[PDB]
Design a binder for this molecule. Structure first.
Ligand code: CLA
Ligand code: CLA
Ligand code: CLA
Ligand code: CLA
Ligand code: CLA
Ligand code: CLA
Ligand code: CLA
Ligand code: CLA
Ligand SMILES: CC(=O)O[C@H]1CC(C)(C)C(=C=C/C(C)=C/C=C/C(C)=C/C=C/C=C(C)/C=C/C=C(\C)C(=O)C[C@@]23O[C@]2(C)C[C@@H](O)CC3(C)C)[C@](C)(O)C1
Ligand code: KC1
Lengths: 169, 173, 214, 196, 173
C-alpha cells in the first residue's frame, strides 16, 4: 500500500471510504503477489477503456465494407459472433504482443528494474517531469480504468436486458 | 554577390524590393541568375518567333509529307502548334533534352561557381572577349530578355482576352 | 522452486534492448553484428545448446559453437535463398516484362503456365531431383566449416566465404564493410517476408497467379 | 507552450494560446516539439491542397497551353485530350468537367498506390532525419533543392527565422482556408463572402 | 582518376552522376571498363549486322544443305535466327566460347592491370603505335559502341512496339 499509489478520497456509497481499500487484506497476506496484482489491474483496465469507446463509435460510423453494415448487422452486440474471420485475426495479433510480454512477466518483481504496467510507450510525450504531477498522472489512469471496468459490465449486460440504443434507458 | 553583377543597369540599379537575393545562400542566387538568363533566351526567341509567323515569312516547300507550310497563311502564330506533327514536335524536344545535359554536365556546375550555360552546337572560343566589354553585353542580353518576358505575356493576353491591351488590340494576329 | 533461476544467466538485468525497450537485452546480442537493434523478444540467442550438433553429434569430441553465431549463419542462408527465390519466382512468371524461361519446350508456357505448378511438374520430370543433388554437393562442401569454428580452429565470420569475384570490398574501411553487410541483412529480411507472402496467397482458395498475387 | 514556442506573434494574445496552452505548459521538450511537427506538416498539406482545389475548381488540366485552344485559366477547354489510365479509359479532361469532391474518385487504383508509396517513402526518410538525428528545429529535413540554408549565418539568420515564422502562418492561413472550402461544397452557403 | 582515360571526351568529361566508379576497388573499375569495351563490340556488330541484309546483301549459294540464303528475301533481320540450323548455330557459339578463353587466359588478367581482350585468331603484333594517337582511337572505339548500344535497343523496340520510335516506324524491317 505504501509507495504503490491508488487509495485516494472517493467515498463509497456504503458508509466507508477508499482512503485505504483492502477489505479482505490482499496486501498483508502474500505481498509477493502485489506486483502481479497491479499488473493485472492495469491490463484489465486498459482493455476495458478501449472496449468502452469500442461500443460508442459502432453506432453512428461503420467503416466502409459490406461484411459489417447496418443492413448486415443492426445490433452491434452481434458483431462478435457474425464476424469470426476478423475475430481470430485480432486474437492472433494480440498473441504476438502478449507473447513478447512473457519474459517481462517471468521477472515481475524485484529482479527486473521496471514497475508493473509501465511500458516504455510514450510516443507523444505526455507523462510529466516531476513526482507531484506524475503520481497524479498515474492515479488518473487507475480511476478511469476502474470506472471503465464496471462500465462495460453494465453496458453489455444492459443490452441483453433492454435491447435498445446507446444510453440504454 | 549582389554587387558587381551583370543585370544592374542605370535606371534602377539593384532592383530587389522584396529582398529575394538574400533569401537563400550564394548557391540560391546563382540558380536565380541562370534562371533569368534562360527565361530571357526562351522569351527572346518566342517574342521574335511571334512577330515573324505573323507577317508571312513562309519557308518554301514541305514541313512534313502532307502538312506543308500552309500553317502561316491562315492560323494565328499561337496556333500552328498542333498542326506540326508529332514526330516533328518530338525531335524539337529531344534536341532540347540533349541541350539541357551539357548545360548540366560541365566540370563545375554553376551554382558551385561554374560557368553559365554555353552553346552546344559550334562552341569556338568564347568570351575571351575583353571583360570590360563583356559586362556591357550581359547587361544587354538580360535587359532584352526582361523586355521579352513581358512582351510574350502581352502576346498571350491579347490572344485570350480581346481589348486587354490598347494599342495592340487593333492588330490581326 | 529453490534453485538459481535460468532467467538470470541469459537476460542481463542492467540494460534494455533498442527494439522493445521494455524487455532487457539478451546477453549475446551486442551492437557488433550488422543489422542489429537488439531484437530478440523470445531470447533465442540465449539458448545454451550447441546447434552444431545437428551436423556433427556432440559425442564425437569436445566442441562448442556459440548459439548467436549459428543463428547468424542460418539467417544469412535464409536471406540468400529467399532473395533469389522471390526474384526467380517472379521472373519466370513474367513479372518483369519478359517471361524468362529456359530454352526448350519442357520449360515453356504450354507445359507450365506459371511458376505455381513448376515444383510439382518439374519434380515428376526430374529436373527438380537433379537440383536437389547439385545443392547437396555444395551444402556438404560448405557446412563442414561450422565444425572448424566450433572447435576454435578458425576465425571466419558467419556467412563469410571468399566470394567477391568483382572485388566490391577489397580495401574498404570497416565502416564501409559493416554498412554493406547491413544491406545483405536488411534486403534479405525484406525478401524472407516477400517470399512468404507470395507463396501463401497464391495457395488459398482464391488468389490468382498473375504478377500481382492478390 | 510558452513564448519560446516560436509560432507566436502579434495578432493573437501573448505567449501561449489561451485554450491550448495547458497541455504543453507542463509537458516535455518531446511533446512541445512533436506538436510543432504536426502543425508544420498539417500546414504543408493545406498549403498544397489550397492550390489543388484552385486548379480543380477552375478546370485547367495537364495539356498546359497558354492560349485559346488548350488549357489555361482563360480557356480550360483544350482540344487535345491525352489519356490518364489506358485500361479503364478515363481521360485527363473529363475529370476537370466534374465537381472537385467528385473528381477525386475518378482516379484509379494504380494512382492511389503510387501516391501512397512515394509519400510513404518520403515519410520514412522524414522520420529518420529528425527524431533520430536530433535536429534542434522542427519540420526540418534535408529537402532543400535550391540550397536556401547554406548562407553566411545558417540557421541563426534573421531571414531563416523569418521564413519559418512565415511558413507556419501561411500554413495556418491555408488550414483555415481549405477547411472553409470543403465546408462550402458539402453544405451550400456555409461561407458567404467571395468564394461560394 | 575517371576523367583522364579512354572514354572521357569533350561534351561530358567524367560522366558518372551516381558515382559507380567509386563503388568498388580498382579491380572493380577494370571489370566495368572491359565490360563496356565488350558491350560495345557486340553492339557495333549487331547494329551494323542489322542494317545490312535489311537491304538485301545476300551471300550467294547455300547456307546449309537445304536451308539456303532465302532468309533475307522475306523474314525480318531480328528473325532468321531459328532459320539458321542447329549445327550452324552451334559452331558460332563455340568459336565464341574459344575466343572467351584467350581473353581470360593471358599472362596477367585485366583486373590485375593486364591487357584488355585482344584479337584471338589473327594476332598482328599492335604494340608499336604512338600512344598519343592510341588514346584518340579508344575514345573513338567506345563512343561508337555507346551509340550502338542505344541503337540496337532502338531496333528491338521498333520490332516489338510499333510506333515506339517516330522517324523510324515508317521503315520496313
Ligand atoms: C481484476 C481486477 C482488479 C485487480 C487485479 C485489482 C488489483 C488491486 N486493487 Mg483494485 N479495483 C478493481 C479491480 C481490480 N483491482 C475494481 C473494478 C475496482 C472498483 C470497485 C477496484 C477498486 C480498488 C480500490 C478502491 C483499491 C484497489 C486496490 C487494489 C490493489 C490492492 C488490493 C489487492 O491486492 O486486491 C486485488 C486482488 C485480487 C485477487 C483481485 C480481486 C479479484 C476478486 C477475487 C474477484 C472476485 C469477484 C469480485 C468480488 C467481483 C464481483 C463480481 C461478481 C462475481 C459478484 C491491487 C493492485 C487498492 C490499492 O490501490 O492499493 C494500493 C485500493 O485502495 N482496488
Ligand atoms: C546541324 C545543325 C545544328 C544542330 C543539330 C544544332 C543543335 C543545337 N544548337 Mg545550334 N547552331 C547551329 C546549328 C545547329 N545547332 C549553327 C550553324 C549555329 C551558328 C554557330 C548554331 C548556334 C547555336 C547557338 C547560339 C545556340 C545553339 C544551341 C543548340 C542546342 C539547342 C537548340 C536546338 O534545338 O537547336 C537545334 C536546331 C537548330 C534548328 C537550327 C540550326 C540548324 C542549322 C540551320 C543547320 C544548317 C547549318 C549548316 C551546318 C551550315 C552550312 C555549312 C555546312 C556544309 C557545314 C542544340 C544542341 C543552343 C545551346 O545552348 O546549345 C547548343 C544555343 O544557344 N546553336
Ligand atoms: C540531321 C538529321 C536529320 C534527319 C535525317 C531528319 C529527317 C527528317 N525530319 Mg528532321 N529535324 C532535324 C534533323 C534531322 N531530320 C533537326 C535537328 C530538327 C530540329 C530539332 C528537325 C526537325 C524536324 C521537324 C520539325 C520535322 C522533321 C521531319 C523529318 C522527316 C520528314 C519525313 C516526312 O515528311 O514524313 C514522312 C525526315 C525523316 C518532319 C516529320 O517527321 O514529320 C512529318 C517534321 O515535321 N524534322
Ligand atoms: C532459390 C533459387 C531458385 C530455385 C530453387 C529455382 C528453381 C527453379 N527454377 Mg529458377 N531462377 C532463379 C532462382 C531459383 N530458381 C533466379 C534467381 C532466376 C533468374 C536469374 C531464375 C530463372 C529461371 C528460369 C529462366 C527458369 C527457372 C526454372 C526453374 C525450375 C527448374 C530449374 C531446374 O530444375 O534447375 C535447372 C537449373 C540448374 C541446374 C542451374 C544450376 C543451379 C546451381 C547448381 C545452383 C547453385 C549455385 C547457386 C547460385 C549458389 C552459389 C553458391 C553459394 C554458396 C553462393 C525450378 C523450379 C525453369 C522453369 O521451370 O520455369 C518455370 C526456367 O525456365 N528459373
Ligand atoms: C491539426 C492542426 C494543428 C496542430 C497540431 C496545432 C498545434 C499547435 N498549435 Mg496551432 N493552429 C492550427 C492547427 C493546428 N495547431 C490552425 C488551423 C490555426 C489557425 C486558427 C492555428 C493557430 C495557432 C496559433 C495562433 C498558435 C498555435 C499554436 C500551436 C501549438 C500549441 C497549441 C496546442 O497545443 O495545439 C492546439 C491543440 C490541438 C491541435 C488539439 C487538437 C484539436 C482537437 C482535437 C480538434 C479541434 C477541431 C475543431 C473543433 C475544429 C473547429 C475549429 C475552430 C476554430 C472553430 C501547437 C504546436 C501556438 C504556438 O505556436 O505555440 C508555441 C500559437 O501561438 N496554433
Ligand atoms: C518514372 C517512373 C514511372 C513509370 C514508368 C510509371 C508508369 C505508370 N504510371 Mg506513374 N507515377 C510515377 C512514376 C512512374 N509511373 C510517379 C513518380 C508518380 C507520382 C507519385 C506517378 C503517379 C501516377 C498516377 C497518379 C497514376 C500513374 C499510373 C501509371 C501507369 C499507367 C497504367 C497503364 O498504362 O495501364 C494500362 C504507368 C505504368 C496510373 C495508374 O496506375 O492507374 C491507371 C495513374 O493513375 N502514375
Ligand atoms: C574450317 C573449318 C570448317 C569446316 C570444315 C566447316 C564445315 C561445314 N560447315 Mg562451317 N563454319 C566454320 C568452319 C568450318 N565449317 C566457322 C569457322 C564458322 C563460323 C563460326 C562456320 C559456320 C557455319 C554455319 C553457320 C553453318 C556451317 C555449316 C557447315 C557444314 C555444311 C553441311 C551442310 O550443308 O549440311 C549437311 C560443313 C560440314 C552449316 C551446317 O552444318 O548446317 C547445315 C551451317 O549452317 N558452318
Ligand atoms: C578465316 C576464318 C576466320 C576465323 C575462324 C576467325 C575466328 C575468330 N575471329 Mg576473326 N577475322 C578473320 C577471319 C576469321 N576469324 C578475318 C579475315 C579478319 C579480318 C582481318 C578477322 C578479324 C577479326 C576481328 C577484328 C575479331 C575477330 C575475332 C574472332 C574470334 C571470335 C569471333 C568470331 O566468331 O569470328 C568468326 C570469324 C569469321 C566468321 C570470319 C568472317 C574467332 C576466334 C574477334 C576476337 O578475336 O575476339 C576477341 C575480333 O574482335 N576476327
Ligand atoms: C503447386 C506446386 O507444384 O508447387 C507448390 C510446392 C509447395 C512446396 C507445396 C508449395 C509450398 C509451400 C511454401 C512455398 C511455403 C512457404 C511458406 C512461407 C515462406 C511462410 C512464411 C511465413 C512468414 C511469416 C509467417 C512471417 C510473419 C511475420 C510476423 C509474424 C511478424 O510479426 C513480423 C513482425 O514482428 C516483426 C518480426 C517485427 C517488426 O519489424 C514487423 C512485425 C511486427 C510485423 C506451394 C507454394 O504450394 C507451391
Ligand atoms: C512462457 C514462457 C516461460 C517458459 C518457456 C519458461 C520455461 C522455464 N522456466 Mg519459467 N517462468 C515464466 C515463464 C516461462 N518459463 C513465468 C511467467 C514465471 C513466473 C510465474 C516463470 C517462473 C519460473 C521459476 C520460478 C523457474 C523457472 C525455470 C524455468 C526453466 C528451466 C528448467 C530447467 O531446464 O531446469 C524453463 C525451461 C526454473 C529455473 O530457472 O531453474 C530450475 C525455475 O526456478 N520459471
Amino acid at each position: 500500500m505504501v509507495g504503490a499509489e491508488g487509495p485516494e478520497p472517493i467515498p463509497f456509497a456504503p458508509s466507508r471510504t477508499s482512503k485505504n481499500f483492502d477489505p479482505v487484506g490482499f496486501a498483508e497476506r502474500s505481498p509477493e503477489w502485489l506486483p502481479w496484482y497491479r499488473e493485472a489491474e492495469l491490463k484489465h483496465g486498459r482493455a476495458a477503456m478501449l472496449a468502452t469507446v469500442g461500443f460508442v463509435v459502432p453506432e453512428f460510423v461503420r467503416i466502409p465494407g459490406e461484411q459489417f453494415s447496418f443492413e448486415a448487422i443492426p445490433k452491434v452486440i452481434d458483431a462478435h459472433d457474425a464476424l469470426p474471420e476478423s475475430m481470430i485475426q485480432i486474437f492472433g495479433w494480440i498473441s504476438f504482443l502478449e507473447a513478447c510480454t512473457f519474459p517481462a512477466m517471468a521477472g515481475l518483481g524485484g529482479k527486473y528494474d521496471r514497475k508493473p504496467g509501465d511500458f516504455s510507450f510514450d510516443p507523444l510525450g505526455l507523462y510529466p517531469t516531476d513526482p507531484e504531477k506524475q503520481k497524479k498522472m498515474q492515479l488518473a489512469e487507475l480511476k478511469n480504468g476502474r470506472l471503465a471496468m464496471i462500465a462495460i459490465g453494465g453496458m453489455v449486460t444492459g443490452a441483453a436486458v433492454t435491447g435498445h440504443g446507446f444510453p440504454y434507458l | 554577390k549582389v554587387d558587381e553583377m551583370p543585370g544592374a543597369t542605370a535606371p534602377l540599379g539593384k532592383f530587389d524590393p522584396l529582398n529575394l537575393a538574400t533569401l537563400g545562400s550564394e548557391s540560391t542566387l546563382a540558380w536565380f541568375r541562370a534562371a533569368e538568363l534562360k527565361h530571357s533566351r526562351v522569351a527572346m526567341l518566342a517574342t521574335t518567333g511571334y512577330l515573324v509567323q505573323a507577317a508571312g515569312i513562309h519557308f518554301p516547300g514541305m514541313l512534313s509529307s502532307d502538312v506543308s507550310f500552309e500553317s502561316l497563311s491562315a492560323m494565328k502564330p499561337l496556333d500552328a502548334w498542333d498542326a506540326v506533327p508529332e514526330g516533328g514536335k518530338n525531335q524539337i524536344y529531344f534536341t532540347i533534352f540533349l541541350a539541357e545535359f551539357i548545360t548540366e554536365c560541365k566540370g563545375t556546375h554553376y551554382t558551385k561557381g561554374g560557368p553559365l550555360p554555353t552553346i552546344v552546337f559550334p562552341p569556338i572560343d568564347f568570351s575571351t572577349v575583353n571583360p570590360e566589354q563583356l559586362k556591357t553585353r550581359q547587361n544587354r542580353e538580360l535587359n532584352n530578355g526582361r523586355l521579352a518576358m513581358i512582351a510574350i505575356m502581352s502576346f498571350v493576353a491579347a490572344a485570350n482576352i480581346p481589348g486587354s491591351v490598347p494599342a495592340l488590340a487593333g492588330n490581326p494576329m | 522452486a529453490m534453485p538459481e533461476r535460468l532467467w538470470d544467466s541469459m537476460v542481463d538485468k542492467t540494460q534494455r534492448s533498442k527494439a522493445v525497450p521494455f524487455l532487457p537485452r539478451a546477453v549475446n546480442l551486442d551492437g557488433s553484428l550488422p543489422g542489429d537493434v537488439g531484437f530478440d523478444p523470445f531470447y533465442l540467442s540465449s539458448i545454451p545448446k550447441d546447434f552444431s550438433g545437428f551436423i556433427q553429434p556432440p559425442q564425437w569430441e569436445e566442441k562448442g559453437i556459440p548459439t548467436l553465431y549459428w543463428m547468424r549463419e542460418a539467417e544469412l542462408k535464409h536471406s540468400r535463398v529467399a532473395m533469389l527465390a522471390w526474384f526467380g519466382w517472379l521472373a519466370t512468371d513474367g513479372a518483369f516484362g519478359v517471361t524468362l524461361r529456359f530454352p526448350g519446350e519442357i520449360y515453356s508456357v504450354e507445359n507450365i503456365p506459371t511458376a505455381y505448378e513448376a515444383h510439382n511438374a518439374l519434380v515428376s520430370q526430374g529436373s527438380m531431383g537433379f537440383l536437389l543433388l547439385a545443392v547437396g554437393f555444395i551444402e556438404f562442401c560448405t557446412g563442414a566449416v561450422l565444425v572448424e569454428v566450433a572447435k576454435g580452429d578458425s576465425d571466419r565470420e558467419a556467412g563469410d566465404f571468399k566470394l567477391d569475384p568483382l572485388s566490391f570490398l577489397k580495401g574498404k574501411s570497416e565502416e564501409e564493410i559493416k554498412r554493406m553487410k547491413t544491406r545483405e541483412i536488411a534486403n534479405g529480411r525484406l525478401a524472407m517476408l516477400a517470399f512468404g507472402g507470395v507463396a501463401t496467397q497464391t495457395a488459398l482458395e482464391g488468389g490468382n497467379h498473375a504478377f500481382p498475387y492478390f | 507552450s510558452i513564448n519560446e514556442a516560436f509560432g507566436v506573434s502579434i495578432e493573437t494574445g501573448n505567449k501561449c494560446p489561451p485554450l491550448g496552452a495547458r497541455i504543453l505548459e507542463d509537458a516535455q521538450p518531446s511533446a512541445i516539439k512533436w506538436f510543432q511537427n504536426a502543425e508544420i506538416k498539417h500546414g504543408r498539406i493545406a498549403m498544397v491542397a489550397t492550390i489543388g482545389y484552385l486548379v480543380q475548381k477552375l478546370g485547367v488540366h495537364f495539356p498546359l497551353y497558354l492560349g485559346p485552344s488548350g488549357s489555361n485559366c482563360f480557356h480550360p477547354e483544350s482540344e487535345t485530350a491525352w489519356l490518364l489510365s489506358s485500361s479503364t479509359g478515363v481521360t485527363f479532361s473529363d475529370i476537370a468537367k466534374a465537381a472537385p469532391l467528385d473528381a477525386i474518385q475518378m482516379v484509379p487504383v494504380a494512382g492511389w498506390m503510387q501516391i501512397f508509396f512515394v509519400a510513404g517513402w518520403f515519410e520514412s526518410v522524414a522520420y529518420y532525419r529528425q527524431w533520430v538525428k536530433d535536429s534542434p528545429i522542427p519540420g526540418d529535413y534535408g529537402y532543400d533543392p535550391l540550397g536556401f540554408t547554406k548562407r553566411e549565418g545558417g540557421w541563426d539568420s534573421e531571414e531563416l527565422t523569418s521564413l519559418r515564422l512565415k511558413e507556419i502562418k501561411n500554413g495556418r492561413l491555408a488550414m483555415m482556408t481549405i477547411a472553409a472550402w470543403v465546408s462550402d461544397e458539402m453544405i451550400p452557403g456555409a461561407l458567404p463572402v467571395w468564394h461560394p
